[PDB]
Swiss-Prot record:
Changing residue 346 to A: Reduces methotrexate uptake. Reduces IRF3 phosphorylation upon cGAMP stimulation. Changing residue 139 to K: Abolishes methotrexate uptake. Residues 33-46, 95-98, 161-165, 243-254, 305-310, 373-380 are extracellular. One of its GO terms (biological process) is folate transmembrane transport. The chain holds residues 19 to 457 of 591 of the full protein. 2',3'-cGAMP binds at residues 115-116, 119, 131, 139, 232, 271, 327, 331, 334, 343, 346, 350. This is Reduced folate transporter.
Amino acid sequence: DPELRSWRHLVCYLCFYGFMAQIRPGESFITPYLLGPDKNFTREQVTNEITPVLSYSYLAVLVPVFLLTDYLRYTPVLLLQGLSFVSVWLLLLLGHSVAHMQLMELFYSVTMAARIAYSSYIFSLVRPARYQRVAGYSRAAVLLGVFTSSVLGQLLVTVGRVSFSTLNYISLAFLTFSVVLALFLKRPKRSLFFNRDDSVLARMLRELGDSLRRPQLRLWSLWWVFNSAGYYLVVYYVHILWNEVDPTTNSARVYNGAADAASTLLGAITSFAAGFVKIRWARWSKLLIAGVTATQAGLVFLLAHTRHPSSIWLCYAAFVLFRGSYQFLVPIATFQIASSLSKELCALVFGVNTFFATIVKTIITFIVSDVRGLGLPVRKQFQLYSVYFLILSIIYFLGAMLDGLRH
Ligand SMILES: CN1c2c(O)nc(N)nc2NC[C@@H]1CNc1ccc(C(=O)N[C@@H](CCC(=O)O)C(=O)O)cc1
């Protein structure tokens, strides 16, 4: 056992690493960079040969990372997420082939699988009497870092007048700094599943079928599997659609970072406003899902049918409201699933729901989006995503009536 770190030097460093690990100013401007005059990629190569590999590689690495997150005690995977972000921005700046960007999506899928490597790091690092204050400060440092990277990426592009290549070298400097900050993180001695000194598995399975027959876990897991698979299929491809609506030559008029900083600012407001709604609106739960999914059905339809370049701000508003609609139902889903679950059980169910949502996301993106399937453009596949939410909101509205008139 090593020497214990100072407490104020620990929380001010977890909230500084969790702030600096989100600083990727050129993250919202990857698609205007790939579809720009610096990359030599067709519009049909980005939406049908590169971006479906993001959902393929996410399915392949979600279970290896989630096991390696708990086996390696959450410090090498926070380093793997930092080194895969450098490998994304090294393949952005030095990659020219389509296979160089399919590899880039492979490295970005490692970082998306390691998004829980920081939320579960401070869970095992901090004692439970001190955890909810540190998890409040950390989460408010993550969503401040996600906000201020899109603001810094927008101010460098619009006000600063830098190119997308220069912005990705600025983003590469903020990402090598996040690798150095991940080296000085205190590794925990025991983990939640594998490193525990002790069975854990036996207990889990035995305490699962009791919790599997809960009408709120079984309802919101089906939301997490299907209504979140269609969510991320919009977020992957909305930057390809914004490059089609307003195909500007000047990089300073792109405003992808202002539309992803506002969706983070609205995503933090609706997630805060959901915390006073998790319990008192849990009875009218299928009607809340069917009301938001039908709202997401109209916003994705509004994205797919705005064709004039002057209505690019309507496409920016129909995605800030789309991310605000989804991030409203995430604290309600996180509460109603993990209410009567253990911490080992809630880590399993949220990992299984994210895995099953990645199977649905892979099945749709192979049929609808991939060139080996249909090979649809981003407008004709956003019309299929619009009727995907409309099919889902009708199923939840029938469930809010065929289980709502039985009283
Ligand atoms: C970088 N960006 C991108 C892009 O713009 N264009 C292509 N072709 N490929 C890619 N690769 C990945 C990424 C677009 N795909 C994603 C994938 C995942 C997220 C994501 O984790 N969103 C989180 C919020 C975290 C955040 O704000 O980044 C959410 O819960 O909605 C957001 C966008």
